[PDB]
Amino acid sequence: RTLKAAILGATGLVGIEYVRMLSNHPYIKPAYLAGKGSVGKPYGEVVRWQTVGQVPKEIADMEIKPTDPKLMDDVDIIFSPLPQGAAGPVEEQFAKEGFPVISNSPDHRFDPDVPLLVPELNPHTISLIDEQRKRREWKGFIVTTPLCTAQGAAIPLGAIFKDYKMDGAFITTIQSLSGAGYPGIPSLDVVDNILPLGDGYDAKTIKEIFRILSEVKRNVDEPKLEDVSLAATTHRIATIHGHYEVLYVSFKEETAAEKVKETLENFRGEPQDLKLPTAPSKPIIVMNEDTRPQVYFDRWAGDIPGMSVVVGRLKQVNKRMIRLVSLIHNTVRGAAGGGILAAELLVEKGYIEK
Amino acid sequence: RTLKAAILGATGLVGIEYVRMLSNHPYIKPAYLAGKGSVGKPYGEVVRWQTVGQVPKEIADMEIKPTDPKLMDDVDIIFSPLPQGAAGPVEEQFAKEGFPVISNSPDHRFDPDVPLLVPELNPHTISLIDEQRKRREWKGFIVTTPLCTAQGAAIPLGAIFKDYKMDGAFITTIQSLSGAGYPGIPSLDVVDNILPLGDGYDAKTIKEIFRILSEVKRNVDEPKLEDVSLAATTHRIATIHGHYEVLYVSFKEETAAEKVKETLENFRGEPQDLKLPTAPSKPIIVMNEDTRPQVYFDRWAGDIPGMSVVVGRLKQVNKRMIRLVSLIHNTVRGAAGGGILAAELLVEKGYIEK
Amino acid sequence: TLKAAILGATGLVGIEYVRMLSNHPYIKPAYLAGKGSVGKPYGEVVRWQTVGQVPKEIADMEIKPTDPKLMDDVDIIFSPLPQGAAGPVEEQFAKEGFPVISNSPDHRFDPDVPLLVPELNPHTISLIDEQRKRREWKGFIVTTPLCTAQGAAIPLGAIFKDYKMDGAFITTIQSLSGAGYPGIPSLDVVDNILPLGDGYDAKTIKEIFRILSEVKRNVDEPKLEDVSLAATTHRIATIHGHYEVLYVSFKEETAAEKVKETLENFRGEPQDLKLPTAPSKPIIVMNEDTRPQVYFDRWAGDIPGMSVVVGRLKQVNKRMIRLVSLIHNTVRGAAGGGILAAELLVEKGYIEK
Amino acid sequence: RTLKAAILGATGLVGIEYVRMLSNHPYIKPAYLAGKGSVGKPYGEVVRWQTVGQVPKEIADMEIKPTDPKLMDDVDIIFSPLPQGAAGPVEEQFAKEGFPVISNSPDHRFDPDVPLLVPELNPHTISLIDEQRKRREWKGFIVTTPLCTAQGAAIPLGAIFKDYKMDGAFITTIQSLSGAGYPGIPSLDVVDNILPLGDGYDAKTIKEIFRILSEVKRNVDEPKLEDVSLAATTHRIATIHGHYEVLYVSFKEETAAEKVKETLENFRGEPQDLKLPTAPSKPIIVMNEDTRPQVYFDRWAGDIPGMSVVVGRLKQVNKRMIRLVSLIHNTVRGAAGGGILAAELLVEKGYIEK
Numbered sequence A, B, D: 001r002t003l004k005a006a007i008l009g010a011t012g013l014v015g016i017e018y019v020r021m022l023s024n025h026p027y028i029k030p031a032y033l034a035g036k037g038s039v040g041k042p043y044g045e046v047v048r049w050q051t052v053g054q055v056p057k058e059i060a061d062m063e064i065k066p067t068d069p070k071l072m073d074d075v076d077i078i079f080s081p082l083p084q085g086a087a088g089p090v091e092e093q094f095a096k097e098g099f100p101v102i103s104n105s106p107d108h109r110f111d112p113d114v115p116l117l118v119p120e121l122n123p124h125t126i127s128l129i130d131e132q133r134k135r136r137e138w139k140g141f142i143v144t145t146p147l148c149t150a151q152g153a154a155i156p157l158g159a160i161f162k163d164y165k166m167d168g169a170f171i172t173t174i175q176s177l178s179g180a181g182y183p184g185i186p187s188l189d190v191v192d193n194i195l196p197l198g199d200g201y202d203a204k205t206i207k208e209i210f211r212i213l214s215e216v217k218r219n220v221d222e223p224k225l226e227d228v229s230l231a232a233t234t235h236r237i238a239t240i241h242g243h244y245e246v247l248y249v250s251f252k253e254e255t256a257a258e259k260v261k262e263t264l265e266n267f268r269g270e271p272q273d274l275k276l277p278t279a280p281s282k283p284i285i286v287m288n289e290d291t292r293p294q295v296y297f298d299r300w301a302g303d304i305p306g307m308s309v310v311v312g313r314l315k316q317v318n319k320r321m322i323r324l325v326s327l328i329h330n331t332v333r334g335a336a337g338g339g340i341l342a343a344e345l346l347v348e349k350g351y352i353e354k
Numbered sequence C: 001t002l003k004a005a006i007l008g009a010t011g012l013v014g015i016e017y018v019r020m021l022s023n024h025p026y027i028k029p030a031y032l033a034g035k036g037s038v039g040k041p042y043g044e045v046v047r048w049q050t051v052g053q054v055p056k057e058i059a060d061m062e063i064k065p066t067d068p069k070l071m072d073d074v075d076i077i078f079s080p081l082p083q084g085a086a087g088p089v090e091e092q093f094a095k096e097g098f099p100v101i102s103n104s105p106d107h108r109f110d111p112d113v114p115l116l117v118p119e120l121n122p123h124t125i126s127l128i129d130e131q132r133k134r135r136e137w138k139g140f141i142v143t144t145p146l147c148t149a150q151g152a153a154i155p156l157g158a159i160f161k162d163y164k165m166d167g168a169f170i171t172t173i174q175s176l177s178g179a180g181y182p183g184i185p186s187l188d189v190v191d192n193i194l195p196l197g198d199g200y201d202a203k204t205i206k207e208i209f210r211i212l213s214e215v216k217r218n219v220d221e222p223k224l225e226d227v228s229l230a231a232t233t234h235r236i237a238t239i240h241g242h243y244e245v246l247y248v249s250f251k252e253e254t255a256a257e258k259v260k261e262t263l264e265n266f267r268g269e270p271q272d273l274k275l276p277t278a279p280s281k282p283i284i285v286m287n288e289d290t291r292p293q294v295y296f297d298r299w300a301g302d303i304p305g306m307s308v309v310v311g312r313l314k315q316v317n318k319r320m321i322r323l324v325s326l327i328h329n330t331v332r333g334a335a336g337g338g339i340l341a342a343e344l345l346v347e348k349g350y351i352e353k
Ligand SMILES: NC(=O)c1ccc[n+]([C@@H]2O[C@H](COP(=O)([O-])OP(=O)(O)OC[C@H]3O[C@@H](n4cnc5c(N)ncnc54)[C@H](OP(=O)(O)O)[C@@H]3O)[C@@H](O)[C@H]2O)c1
Pocket: A008, A009, A010, A011, A012, A013, A014, A015, A034, A035, A036, A037, A038, A039, A067, A080, A081, A082, A083, A084, A086, A087, A104, A105, A106, A146, A147, A148, A178, A179, A180, A181, A182, A183, A330, A331, A334, A335
């Protein structure tokens, strides 16, 4: 019937989305709220509920418990949105104790035996678990979801690359504060200011996009991914949720904006075909107004709110270049929501027992 | 020997920069402050001094006077930052009454006998005045300055186009509130939001960049400007001053980021050679840190604060593509400061008598 | 099963009528009216500056003219119209026989028009009968007070009912939505605080006084004429939520702990009658010294946005306490208060099925 | 001759104001710039210049030096804006080495032998230095300046208390981000939010106000300060500088707002009588418009920008109650500026030699 989940980092900006979404989930229960600094306290009392609505009634009085595999014989699934550096070793201890771990943290994203999973783009990479368990000599496993900023690009770019001779994408991002966590970005960095994130962050963004694109099954074979040029210039400003990206996308041969638009509108993959509960009907929603999408108004779009990437502004720049913009909800699709969708995919494929 | 200026729209976001800058100018005097709504009242009491420092002491008691040429016998120069639509015909009346008019308004920016002037890029186009006067059959003249957002791009792009085989620039802008004037942008459009300006504004921005580039004297001759692809995706957020732009610039042939960076660092033009009072020593300042320029910290940079375009983040994307960002103070270089510098060039060239 | 028209349906108040009536057990949002936007699909023109998404069965409705003759089938008019335009329009609707629940200022001081906070002065709906006879109309007008006045008068009314309150000195830090759209320019509030000025301060206390003058008290000291009120009002860059700091003085020694229990226990006719939009706790009291906060508490309560959230109850001296209050300015402060008033009027037989 | 100052915490939000103001001071030079983390590096490269203008050119290349009494033989004055906890003992080490220490830190604010100094209000309390040197057995001394929030209230309240039977003041504050320092207040605490500071901060505020008021020499003797009731409810929002306060002020007997207004307009103290360089002409500036003062427009008011408290909105509430508002620049008057003014007074009264 129902799987009992633990949410690690349950009070954090990603944790609250697991709590919110799992409270309404048909078969995965938020059964165990883990923390460190606030172990012992009622969740409703200490959480910064920086998201829609209010802490779920049935969750407010639940006690925050230790992050300890041995206290968790009763848990079936581990969701892990832990800070970088701390996540890595914890997620291994859970896998070594036999748990399926779905991680939103960066630590394991480039391990060659760990899926870097966007369920609509590279669902077959869950097969990596087999080799992982064998070589790591553990009975559980780790899957990761990618950097939210990498997903806001990789989703529409992956859709495009599957059917077109895309040879470059040159990206500018304007990301929200919640992507940095709490305390995260100091207020003085973003009041009357735009904070560039710097070369390191630009680089890791395209690095993750390349891995995700390398794992997409294409309908055309040109150009080779090695010959695709990607670049990002990334920034944070004083928005709460929603990462906005402007993409100039180039092609090896003449490509019509209107054909690419239809490809984006019609985009679907295995989560849709399988009818997974958290799969949006329209993982890419395309808007036609020239002032949409906007962060405030469109970050909760779609039949599963916050699970759809919202694209718009599709326009021919020249015969071999188009402009589009994309908006992703950074803690729903970009983190917890993609993590729950991944869990549903793993359950359906037989990797996690119901 | 000195000149008396009138400042039309003196209380507006551009007008206050003319007031602030001219209060210290060695020879152009802010003598007549014009307006519509508050005519009769002291300047200091009606103005929203949304800029550095305080209303100048010898200005605050000056009365706001009508915009009427028949009241203006004693004035030598008109500065005109009037709204789109209202500006065109008023600017014509002033020219017909014999006044030199330096306008920051869009209305005359594409008249082929009217200069669209960035003093460092196309100073020779002041020559259009001779034909203008003949054909319009007036004794005065109109000179315009370009859209601030177009200058933020055209200054660095013009310096590059001069010396390199630039064949494309793909731009994303993150502009400040003050560019829209007052009441300008509603607060609800920009709190926890990014506001795209739309296809019209994107189109007019590149149209102005094309006209400016078409008038830059190049040291190379490939490609022809007709084969350069330009595109912009423009937005406003809740910054007060400073327009921030991300430029991906492509070349016809292999081109080194470090060479382009030196061309930018070394950029100077006729305003520097002439030592005009408002000419920055470094019309383009290059920063090397991967988190600079930042809007709050770098919008008043330079020996003439706010007159320099600040570029940074220079980086190779691939052999034929570089990334850079630029920051322009939208009401100093982008409007009043550019206008004062234009006037200084016209005075020095004998178009305005001293 | 009653049909409502929502006037000003695309406005910051109108979107709350649409959001809340979409799921109401018995009042259906049947007609969306406008001015500039008439003839367009509601979903295409609306700035949905509120939680969630435009309700699907409302997004496809066509915005219709604000015209009393075109509304044969409607039982209730909700009227969040601009000051000046509101007055005459609301009169035409009452004249045509419609119950008119108004959030606009125009009629708020007419002595035959309720200025209604359902938990504080529900008996003033009685004014309607004399209203209908003297104005000679079959419909009627009821108004809801200024959101800022409600943020103060709800907790001040609960206190005034049971304690010898003789003063309240108020500072407000109000949200941008209170001014509507285009409303407040962005340059007035970025890196700034915008005082609203003497007129707004004066109208806030004038409304509070009329409300307090209509509260049924359990004590009789001091007389209201001897109560001193003052407000200093401001807006900042918050989206919804009006936040108020109140220093409240009393004629005699009064315990903050007792006043805190009175606020926690406060209930009125809406709660007694179990009206669908009546919150269980019209006043919610928080204990943390950093709460309420605008972002986190403005949607509090079993009916989200309908409760006034109070906190920071503290003894200043024997005859003075400090508290703060937070009201959702378009839910409790406008449309949600309006809907609760409608349910009260239905229950009391003033609006017929 | 000039006095050579050391500025501790030179790169902080208070440090930058010492740097800016001392750069133009007639006789106190910013000679030694101290730090901890950034020791060794050029000041210009590491500072966040979150203030007006730019880092002074003669300062930019100065190296940040260790906070160590032994390196400072050449130093005549120490300005100390160090974090609470760390300041106490350090400021003691400097005084023990014979240095005059002007502190903005809270640590010694309530030592009964250490002045808690607002130069216009309690200038005679510098006398405390004599007992201080004797009892502590040190050649130097410590003087503190008060919490900026407390100064915003105590300046107007002290001018009133001097001449009226004031018996209560009930204060609400709306404070800026820079008052918390950097990284200071998290962005997520203030975007679309108001952050209450809590009971502790409300109490320390009135505790400091009482000490200040108790040291004001009055012209009336009722009521006794022990019988005055003070309360504050404090908050921060997303403003950069400037603390705004609403005060309801009660009196034991009938008192006219217009009379109190004139008292405020006319306020002056020893700093003005002595013509100290950093003493504003009008330490309280009174505005008449019912929408002034406003944080952005009035935080730099006055002939010494940022050194005047700006009051407005004077209004009769009842015969014994008035309402006013005050705005203080929190790092100028509220910190460095008041600190420099204290220094000038201490030099003028002969506590600091030359
Ligand atoms: N936010 C996004 O948009 C986003 C998107 C995708 C992925 N992610 C990733 O998800 C992770 C968390 O992000 P966030 O934004 O939610 O961070 P955050 O708001 O700073 O949350 C930190 C949370 O983790 C807990 N925690 C910290 N250290 C721990 C430890 N050593 N052991 C157990 N629990 C610990 C804390 O609990 P206590 O307070 O009880 O100690 C807190 O609940 C990061 O790796 C981030 O990169 C972020």
